[PDB]
Design a binder for this molecule. Structure first.
Ligand SMILES: O=P(O)(O)C(O)(c1cccc(-c2cccc(-c3ccccc3)c2)c1)P(=O)(O)O
Ligand SMILES: O=P(O)(O)C(O)(c1cccc(-c2cccc(-c3ccccc3)c2)c1)P(=O)(O)O
Lengths: 277, 282
């Protein structure tokens, strides 16, 4: 039962949405720190290890519907979404999930207005810079997954720093997927394979499903167990395409800025129920 | 509105599942493909405009063994009942105007079942194709196999290869009958072919694009899946049409495959046609 037990009543909480960016609380010093509990003070459900998803992937959908209901720009929905990412990371640690893949920026987003794309590049750069120390302290290992063309060098470089600083952590790994597309990533694995073949380092007849797996950008990513998408949308949208071929999908109706760790836990309790059915 | 109109009231119905194999009725001549028999309920396809219909539906046929188990029957009986369901779905797809239909008959994962289950399923798929190939031809269905050659029985490939040759000029609907199919495997096989072309100095690695992978899949004419359906409450894509379904809409239906009929296909298609299409979606 790999859950952290309920925090003491007085242990720090997260998120305090009275400031933007939300200020992550000081924690008592431990190794990694125990993450703050949710503001509701709910505790993670008891799910046995062999029924827990090892790897959860999340498409964080609904930020513009959320902002539209409030007469705000979509960028306000993105802003509120930053604290939900952190809260979900805290929740995932409390529950004992080991891998979390987050679809921060699809290759499809290049169709959005250039002003919004520029905001999202800047914003993802800033989130990583602003949260890198908090992630390090909680024992998160983070790194970039995605494709290089068009992506701002500053975002790649900022994740590269957070990956270097968190390389030894092992409480949870977050794949922070930026300019990511599943077909694109498989096509890059195939290009790599092709380079190795043009070079005579690899025999085409030896190519198997493992060869593709070994040549993906991050070959250490395990299969996705549980694939989640918010806002009621029931598509995988090319996210973790290779890795989620055998995933279970749980499509939830809440909009991402309204989501919190208790919703992640409820999807994980459902996933654990289906290990029986 | 590319639906066929409601059929005449005395137009032949299908399926009558009181006998096995199920009888497919004689149909009046055309000129041209025959109009499919209407469902036993005589329901007519809903009027969904062409711009809101899926061009390509993929279906995993789930729950055959669970269905037979609930009735205390051998699991082979659920499979046998799913044959008429495949044909009924093909007739309802034609009535609705669907142009592409992919059916997941046997997965690369299925070699993990017992030898007796595998022999049964390989032999039963061979037999379905033989039994139904003339009927599909008469309905203007273009049918062909999609899947991986290693392990797959040569008798299955042979029956599908003749069905493919018999129906190659048909154009009412294409059915990809997917047997020993695994999406990662089909991508690996495309990557092998690309690698062969590179080793032969015919393709340069820096000219490889997503299109190159698409052009080297086994059947490169298959369009993207617009609507991906599971039955029996399964909520996974199980490696089916993995490259082609990357942007599909998923609907996970509860009904077991042997209980399924063309009205369930139409209802999933009505649900798909109603979904709001969000920013940037094809
Ligand atoms: O997924 P988002 O909520 O960011 C989205 O749905 C979105 C982004 C920005 C604005 C909206 C939007 C625009 C116009 C109307 C509405 C709407 C909201 C609630 C009820 C009816 C319409 C929502 C919707 P998108 O996938 O189309 O980009
Ligand atoms: O009841 P089974 O394990 O034979 C079943 O779940 C099954 C069998 C073989 C492969 C997948 C699923 P089915 O009820 O969908 O036929």
């Amino acid at each position: 039962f790999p859950q952290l037990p309920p925090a003491p009543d007085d242990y720090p909480t997260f998120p305090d949405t009275s400031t933007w960016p939300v200020v992550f609380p000081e924690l008592p010093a431990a190794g990694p720190c125990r993450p703050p509990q949710h503001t509701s003070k709910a505790a993670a459900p008891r799910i046995p290890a062999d029924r827990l998803p090892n790897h959860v992937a999340i498409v964080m959908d609904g930020n513009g519907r959320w902002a539209t209901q409030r007469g705000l720009a979509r960028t306000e929905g993105h802003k509120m979404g930053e604290a939900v990412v952190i809260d979900i990371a805290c929740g995932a640690i409390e529950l004992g999930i080991k891998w979390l893949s987050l679809y921060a920026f699809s290759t499809e987003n290049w169709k959005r207005s250039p002003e919004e794309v520029r905001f999202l590049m800047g914003f993802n750069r800033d989130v990583v810079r602003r949260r890198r120390d908090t992630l390090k302290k909680l024992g998160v290992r983070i790194r970039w997954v995605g494709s290089r063309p068009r992506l701002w060098r500053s975002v790649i470089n900022e994740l590269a720093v957070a990956e270097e600083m968190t390389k030894s952590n092992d409480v949870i790994t977050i794949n922070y997927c930026v300019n990511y597309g599943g077909r694109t990533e498989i096509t890059e694995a195939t290009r790599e394979i092709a380079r190795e073949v043009a070079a005579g380092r690899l025999n085409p007849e030896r190519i198997t499903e493992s060869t593709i797996a070994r040549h993906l950008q991050r070959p250490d990513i395990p299969d996705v167990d549980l694939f989640l998408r918010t806002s009621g949308e029931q598509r995988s949208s090319n996210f973790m395409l290779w890795q989620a071929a055998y995933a279970e999908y749980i499509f939830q109706d809440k909009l991402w800025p309204d989501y919190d760790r208790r919703d992640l836990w409820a999807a994980c309790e459902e996933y654990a129920s289906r290990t029986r059915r």
